[PDB]
Amino acid sequence: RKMAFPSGKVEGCMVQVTCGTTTLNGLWLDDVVYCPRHVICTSEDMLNPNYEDLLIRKSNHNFLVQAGNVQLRVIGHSMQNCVLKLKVDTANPKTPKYKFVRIQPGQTFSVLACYNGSPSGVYQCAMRPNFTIKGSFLNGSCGSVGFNIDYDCVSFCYMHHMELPTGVHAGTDLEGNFYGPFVDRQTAQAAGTDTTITVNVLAWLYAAVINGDRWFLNRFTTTLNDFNLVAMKYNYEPLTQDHVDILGPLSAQTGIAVLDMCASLKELLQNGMNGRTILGSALLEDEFTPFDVVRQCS
Amino acid sequence: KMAFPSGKVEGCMVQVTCGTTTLNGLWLDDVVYCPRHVICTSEDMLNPNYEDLLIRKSNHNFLVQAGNVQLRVIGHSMQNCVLKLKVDTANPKTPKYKFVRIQPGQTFSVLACYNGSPSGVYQCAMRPNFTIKGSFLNGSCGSVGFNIDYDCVSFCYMHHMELPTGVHAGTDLEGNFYGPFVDRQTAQAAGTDTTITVNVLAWLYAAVINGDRWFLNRFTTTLNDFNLVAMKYNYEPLTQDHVDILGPLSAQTGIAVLDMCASLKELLQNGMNGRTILGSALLEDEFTPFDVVRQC
Numbered sequence: 140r141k142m143a144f145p146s147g148k149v150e151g152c153m154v155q156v157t158c159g160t161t162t163l164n165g166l167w168l169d170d171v172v173y174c175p176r177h178v179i180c181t182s183e184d185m186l187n188p189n190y191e192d193l194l195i196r197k198s199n200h201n202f203l204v205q206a207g208n209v210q211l212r213v214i215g216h217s218m219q220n221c222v223l224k225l226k227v228d229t230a231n232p233k234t235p236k237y238k239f240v241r242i243q244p245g246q247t248f249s250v251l252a253c254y255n256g257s258p259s260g261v262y263q264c265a266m267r268p269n270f271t272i273k274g275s276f277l278n279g280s281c282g283s284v285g286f287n288i289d290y291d292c293v294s295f296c297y298m299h300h301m302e303l304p305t306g307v308h309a310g311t312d313l314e315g316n317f318y319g320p321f322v323d324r325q326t327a328q329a330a331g332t333d334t335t336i337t338v339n340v341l342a343w344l345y346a347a348v349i350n351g352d353r354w355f356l357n358r359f360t361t362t363l364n365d366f367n368l369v370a371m372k373y374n375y376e377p378l379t380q381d382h383v384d385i386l387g388p389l390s391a392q393t394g395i396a397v398l399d400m401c402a403s404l405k406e407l408l409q410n411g412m413n414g415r416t417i418l419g420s421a422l423l424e425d426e427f428t429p430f431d432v433v434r435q436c437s
Numbered sequence: 438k439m440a441f442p443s444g445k446v447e448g449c450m451v452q453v454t455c456g457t458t459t460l461n462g463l464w465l466d467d468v469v470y471c472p473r474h475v476i477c478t479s480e481d482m483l484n485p486n487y488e489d490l491l492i493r494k495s496n497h498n499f500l501v502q503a504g505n506v507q508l509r510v511i512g513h514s515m516q517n518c519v520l521k522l523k524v525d526t527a528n529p530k531t532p533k534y535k536f537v538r539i540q541p542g543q544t545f546s547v548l549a550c551y552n553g554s555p556s557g558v559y560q561c562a563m564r565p566n567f568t569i570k571g572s573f574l575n576g577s578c579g580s581v582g583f584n585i586d587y588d589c590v591s592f593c594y595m596h597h598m599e600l601p602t603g604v605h606a607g608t609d610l611e612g613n614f615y616g617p618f619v620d621r622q623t624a625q626a627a628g629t630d631t632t633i634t635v636n637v638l639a640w641l642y643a644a645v646i647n648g649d650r651w652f653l654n655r656f657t658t659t660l661n662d663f664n665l666v667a668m669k670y671n672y673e674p675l676t677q678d679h680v681d682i683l684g685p686l687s688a689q690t691g692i693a694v695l696d697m698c699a700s701l702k703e704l705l706q707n708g709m710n711g712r713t714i715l716g717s718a719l720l721e722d723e724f725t726p727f728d729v730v731r732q733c
């Protein structure tokens with residue numbers, strides 16, 4: 140199952156940011172609030188905004204930042220790519236240890252879905268190879284963030300900005316750089332065709348082996364290049380060197396070399412399951428990373 | 438599959454140790470709640486006479502830790518399968534809360550913890566056979582399940598054990614088990630499980646709301662004729678209150694409840710023929726009608 144990180148350290152950072160009647164969520168860390176820059180847009184400006192021009196018209200006193208009903212005074216503002224940074228006069232006492240990270244496709248993270256600065260729910264998301272996520276976002280959710288927690292430290296990796304015609308979602312890292320080819324404009328935009336996250340399918344096969352479900356292990360191996368060329372014909376992602384390395388721990392735990400598992404997967408792609416199941420499913424799961432597999436099995 | 442934000446519960450988790458047994462406790466005001474089997478040794482667990490084992494314990498045999506800080510136990514009592522440890526310190530992070538006993542088919546969020554530290558949060562349902570399909574490992578006992586309404590946390594589950602099939606069992610916060618289970622180290626089977634029909638229907642309505650409707654059809658059915666088929670396939674019967682509960686989703690989608698029942702009947706008799714619904718190859722039954730509504 141999809142297991143999220145405990146959300147409390149992030150709940151303690153959520154605020155709301157309002158310009159006129161446009162309200163979205165912001166992230167309050169130390170004395171800075173981060174939020175999507177389109178908070179400065181009127182509904183009519185979103186159709187195609189000139190962000191630099193809209194911002195020059197704004198002053199600190201135009202931004203309403205609230206933690207609950209308590210206003211936080213803004214003392215400076217700047218735009219960094221597609222995010223606004225609002226300097227406020229109070230350092231957030233609940234600021235966790237944190238960092239800003241830019242994740243790769245296939246990586247998973249927890250989303251704390253928020254409305255009006257109030258958290259509604261937490262769930263696990265995977266960044267697709269086409270740089271969309273299958274979120275559960277409604278109007279007012281922008282500025283909700285995605286994150287991982289490692290020991291004491293919250294790694295923020297996603298801030299929510301928009302929905303695409305197909306129902307999937309797009310956003311930025313906390314430096315305001317979109318994942319994928321998207322722009323924060325209320326225009327119709329299409330994601331590239333999606334593909335299957337090979338490194339996560341391999342993680343899932345390793346998980347199956349750990350649990351004693353290993354009928355699919357074959358006697359063969361392959362080169363990485365040969366595997367990548369075959370996998371693309373089945374709309375699977377090619378593997379990177381980094382993928383091979385993050386499978387290291389599971390390969391060590393099972394004694395199954397990464398390239399042997401690749402050969403087992405190739406046979407499943409070429410011959411199908413033949414009516415068999417793996418971990419109680421005829422479908423190969425691609426939204427559990429190698430870290431997720433280790434998280435849940437211990 | 439969306440869980441409630443877990444912060445209000447994280448601020449209540451502590452570590453409870455007795456002997457070489459460690460698990461989690463729930464610290465509310467000046468009381469820590471935890472599974473009573475913490476007082477057992479390996480031998481005691483086979484057939485523990487808990488009242489006899491507990492009378493032999495002193496307050497100082499319980500080590501309670503909230504982070505780096507030890508909380509001194511100044512008294513203890515047992516309520517069914519839960520131990521209540523009175524401590525000298527009040528938890529300033531205690532939320533507004535209540536203890537509820539949930540009904541089968543209801544959902545809740547689980548904050549899985551180890552050594553008093555939160556590790557993950559996820560949504561579970563109380564199965565009709567009163568197990569839960571959780572993800573709990575060694576040391577997870579005392580992890581709790583909850584729902585949040587406005588500011589109020591309703592605690593409904595505390596974790597005690599894993600069955601041979603890999604599913605999980607536990608108590609309400611009064612210490613009464615869900616199901617016919619006992620906190621002893623013996624292999625226990627559950628009753629035959631069934632599928633939560635009202636939840637399957639809610640999930641089908643969710644699939645429609647999200648623009649998927651390949652499973653719809655032009656048939657209909659009476660409630661009783663649907664229930665005959667449901668019971669044949671070990672689905673729970675659908676009551677008239679269930680139908681009422683599903684009204685909002687039926688209105689939203691323009692699909693009468695009994696029409697969706699006819700769709701589910703077709704799926705039960707014909708399978709899915711390799712298709713998927715909301716990504717799943719199986720009919721999902723751990724989303725309630727309220728869950729679907731809150732998220733759509």
Ligand SMILES: *[C@@H](O)[C@H](C[C@@H]1CCNC1=O)NC(=O)[C@H](CC(C)C)NC(=O)OC[C@@H]1C[C@@H]2CCC[C@@H](C2)C1
Nearest residue numbers: 474482573574575576577578597598599620621622
């Ligand atoms: C919490 O103390 C613990 C949580 C269990 C451990 C594994 N998964 C869980 O949910 N509860 C127990 O250990 C419980 C104590 C009795 C009620 C006195 N017994 C129990 O759950 O037995 C089953 C586990 C399953 C697993 C594989 C074999 C050896 C261990 C670990 C027994």
Ligand SMILES: *[C@@H](O)[C@H](C[C@@H]1CCNC1=O)NC(=O)[C@H](CC(C)C)NC(=O)OC[C@H]1C[C@@H]2CCC[C@@H](C2)C1
Nearest residue numbers: 177185276277278281300301302304323324326327
């Ligand atoms: C937060 O402000 C919202 C969150 C959105 C709304 C509902 N679900 C979501 O994920 N963000 C937006 O409304 C953005 C603002 C602009 C990027 C500045 N726009 C948006 O998401 O529009 C959706 C869009 C989808 C199709 C393509 C373009 C026209 C319509 C059809 C609407």
